[PDB]
Design a binder for these strands. Structure first.
Lengths: 141, 99, 185, 84
RNA sequence: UAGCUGGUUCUCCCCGAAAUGACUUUAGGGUCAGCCUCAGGCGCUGACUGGGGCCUGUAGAGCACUGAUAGGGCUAGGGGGCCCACCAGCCUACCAAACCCUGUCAAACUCCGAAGGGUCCCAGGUGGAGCCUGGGAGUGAGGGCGCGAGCGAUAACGUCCGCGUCCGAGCGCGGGAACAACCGAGACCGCCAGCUAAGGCCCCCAAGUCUGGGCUAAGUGGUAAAGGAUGUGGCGCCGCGAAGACAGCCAGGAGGUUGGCUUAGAAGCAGCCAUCCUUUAAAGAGUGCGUAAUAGCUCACUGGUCGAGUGGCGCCGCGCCGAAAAUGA
RNA sequence: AGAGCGCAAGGGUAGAAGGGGGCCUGACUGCGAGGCCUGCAAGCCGAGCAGGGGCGAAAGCCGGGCCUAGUGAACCGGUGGU
RNA sequence: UCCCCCGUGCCCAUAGCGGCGUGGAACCACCCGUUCCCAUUCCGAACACGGAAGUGAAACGCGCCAGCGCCGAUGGUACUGGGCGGGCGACCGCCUGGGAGAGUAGGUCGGUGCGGGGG
């Protein structure tokens, strides 16, 4: 449960997402990598649910590192009030992640630790994903 | 350090670039559009008289009459460091009407 | 090591690629033309030699010329290799990224702590005549809470530097435990 | 229908704009007095026989045709072919 | 009196639009534009593009702007401890500016910057083009579908703008089984004339049970997923192996060791910390089972017996399940 | 050029518009080719003409302030001048 | 006629920076004296007047490590006026015309118009 802090403005429009990711598809940080893969939003619940699965099964292990950051105003409106007035308020602090967008990396474990952790983690997300190693993403700034 | 385009005031619509330094006066008539000058006259690089105050004066006028054989009318005084001290060359008697 | 090559012409990417090949564009100081190679052996061979080492690609035009790759430009969506660029071999003060191998078992480690490496291929210089393969460096007396880096690395004589160099090479960090859920509160 | 006290906004506003920008292009024969450009800042410094009014308006001073010139640290300048 | 309603009638032809902007005690009333049409008066000008000149800040991208930044790192200061009142020596499993480098988020941010678009001058462009006039008008909720922003919940056949257009005015024709806008085509009338578009040849219904090589085994096709599988073909990676594999058999499958430790006891085996070697062909500080914990079945290991293949991974197609509603299919 | 520029934002500017001061008072009378916009009304800029000022020695600058809200057609009456 | 320094306009950061060399007779920075000029919210530091003393350092133009800076193609994607097709959704793919930034090699401490001081 992290985010920015009421920066500049607080309500911002919806979105349609073809495919580009803007980039950010490599190791650089640590080692073994979990790669997100569909055009959608990353849910905070699923942020720290992935963190759950991780330190949950793998406890007293090594270190895990982040590249991402969940921050989106889920413009939600009150119920049964009949549609119209206003936009809504900043719930569902999701983030914007498309296919091929990687995101999570582990370091200081065994191969299988990564493997299993990434399995259950992928079992949690509002979609699904893939996972790989370290060899051909060298040079990426 | 007298940028300010004091020369924008002089980019009015006619110029005349000069200078004064140590023992020499550097007076020249310049037309612009491309930056094509015209006339020349100096203090000591002319073997004139040997006193800055007097020389200054008539040197302006010297060049002026020379310009009268080359054909001009009105321009603008061009310089960066000045405070403006007349220098009764003040290229005014010096043809220009100056001031 | 040795790989194939072929002179490229005025042909377009997708064709060469989606067939089973991959185009490139070599150059060196006084050079900049276009070339290409085959896919499968490209992929395979790049696991080994790579930017770790030097490539000796054979042109059917005769000259089995040794160069180096660099720039590779992925397809970013359903991705993989999709356009390598080639610098060519010289001997001048040239720069590249040397692979590494940190060896040993230190004190932060074993206790449970974990190393955070910040570099494997590093920004350095040399003359291609030299063969400073892959530098295998020091990890004997390491402790959590401290970092090692900078101009503290070994040099196979001749190899100059190209950084600042206070660039952090690595640092040992305290692991993660479910007692960080005591912070969840 | 369990309709409860909602909130009331204010964000129903904006400005209303004219047709701000380059009125005349170059290659167009102008007739002294034609306003040629509207602008806010001194984005385009007026030039040779191109004048300005308080509203940074670059109208035609002479008879002829618009032209442009730019230098690095000086900005964007505009003139007009004069014709005798 | 009615900004509102029901009726308004014979015929041929040439036309052909609105559903948008300013506004209204105005929102279903109406004045101006807007296009229609008519009649007089002018001539490449209209859409469109090659050329060339000039304006943009959007997709996308970008951290150098304005902001957010994950992490390590190091470094300022202090909070602060010991510290001294002649003043300062000093410290920092801390709070941590900056910066660094690992990395990134932005309709109201922009170092960059598209396809372009708009339009200007020369040239092309005779067309229910273009200019002027005035005469008379209707029209001021449009809507389908695409593609693009939005309140919407990436809900509605809610949806307000944007471009685009069909219907409206073409519920005229051919398809879509039947369905104004999903595709094909401007119908002046006749035609027992052939071409032909959408889609079609098993049929009603017009057209090949055509010719050919694979793939599928559910009726997939008749239309579902997250996810799951010795369903099948084809590519490809790695080793064991004729010194003989795999698989089934005899045989050990050990000892310090009951490892440490805790523990009522914890013997490979509840568990946490945990890497030694030895009789060797071969036994793992032991894989699951087992006891109250031992004991015990065990398998990895290894030799043979034996005879020709075998097991695992990555990949591309089709099928499988995930799949339960209210008249009768 | 991140200060600032009167209040908000954008632009933009120290080649000023900001900051210090001397003299003044074009915060001019009667016209204005010309056009942006634009249904209409409206808003807007404007070099140059005759009058006749202020400063700068002059070349020249000023027909209110760096700009975009501080503004309200008509009917009706007060006011002085002519 | 090949030619040495400066008033000075244009090229847009290769022109800018630390530094590295630089000249001085002439140019210039100055130097020098506040008598002349007029000037400072104070100070002759801003500007004039006058020189014999006298500097080449601080200053400019000019010659350089090219670390920083800026210039930066070649090839490919990202998308897309335009056209033709598949979706539980969200999306996509082929053609036509395009072509970034980024990665990259690479490049420069200045290019130049007039006028006057000259080996």
């Amino acid at each position: 449960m992290l985010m920015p802090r009421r920066m500049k403005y607080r309500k911002q429009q919806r979105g349609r997402l073809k495919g580009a990711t803007k980039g950010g598809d490599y190791v650089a940080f640590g080692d073994y990598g979990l790669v997100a893969l569909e055009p959608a939003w990353i849910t905070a619940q699923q942020i720290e649910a992935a963190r759950v699965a991780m330190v949950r099964h793998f406890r007293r292990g090594g270190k895990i590192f982040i590249r991402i950051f969940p921050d989106k105003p889920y413009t939600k409106k009150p119920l049964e009030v009949r549609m119209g007035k206003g936009k809504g308020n900043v719930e569902g602090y999701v983030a914007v992640v498309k296919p091929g967008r990687v995101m999570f990396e582990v370091a200081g474990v065994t191969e299988e630790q990564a493997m299993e952790a990434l399995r259950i983690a992928g079992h949690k997300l509002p979609i699904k994903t893939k996972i790989v190693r370290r060899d051909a993403y060298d040079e990426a700034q | 350090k007298f940028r300010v385009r004091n020369r924008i005031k002089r980019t009015g619509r006619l110029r005349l670039s000069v200078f004064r330094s140590l023992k020499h006066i550097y007076a020249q008539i310049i037309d612009d559009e491309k930056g094509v000058t015209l006339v020349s006259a100096s203090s000591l690089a002319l073997k004139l008289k040997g006193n800055k105050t007097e020389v200054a004066r008539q040197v302006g006028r010297a060049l002026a009459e020379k310009a009268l054989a080359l054909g001009i009318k009105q321009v603008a005084f061009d310089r960066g460091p000045y405070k403006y001290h007349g220098r009764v060359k003040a290229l005014a008697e010096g043809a220009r009407e100056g001031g | 090591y040795r790989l194939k090559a072929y002179y490229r012409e005025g042909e377009k990417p997708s064709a060469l690629r989606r067939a089973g090949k991959l185009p490139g564009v070599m150059y060196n100081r006084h050079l900049n033309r276009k070339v290409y190679v085959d896919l499968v052996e490209f992929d395979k061979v790049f696991r080994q030699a790579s930017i770790h080492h030097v490539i000796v690609l054979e042109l059917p035009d005769g000259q089995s010329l040794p160069t180096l790759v660099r720039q590779v430009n992925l397809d970013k969506r359903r991705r993989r290799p999709e356009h390598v660029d080639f610098f060519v071999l010289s001997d001048e003060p040239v720069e590249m990224y040397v692979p590494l191998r940190f060896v040993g078992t230190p004190a932060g480690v074993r206790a449970g702590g974990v190393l955070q490496e910040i570099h494997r291929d590093i920004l350095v210089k040399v003359s291609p005549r030299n063969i400073p393969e892959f530098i295998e460096v020091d990890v004997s007396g390491l402790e959590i809470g401290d970092s090692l880096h900078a101009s503290d690395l070994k040099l196979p004589p001749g190899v100059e530097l190209a950084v600042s160099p206070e660039e952090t090479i690595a640092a040992v960090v305290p692991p993660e435990d479910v007692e960080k859920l005591a912070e969840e509160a | 229908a369990h309709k409860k006290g909602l909130g009331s906004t204010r964000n129903g506003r904006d400005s209303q704009a004219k047709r701000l920008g380059v009125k005349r292009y170059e290659g167009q024969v102008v007739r002294a007095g034609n306003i040629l450009v509207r602008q806010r800042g001194t984005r385009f410094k007026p030039g040779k026989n191109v004048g300005m009014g308080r509203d940074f308006t670059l109208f035609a001073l002479v008879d002829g045709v618009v032209e442009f010139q730019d230098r690095g640290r000086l900005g964007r300048y505009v003139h007009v072919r004069p014709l005798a």
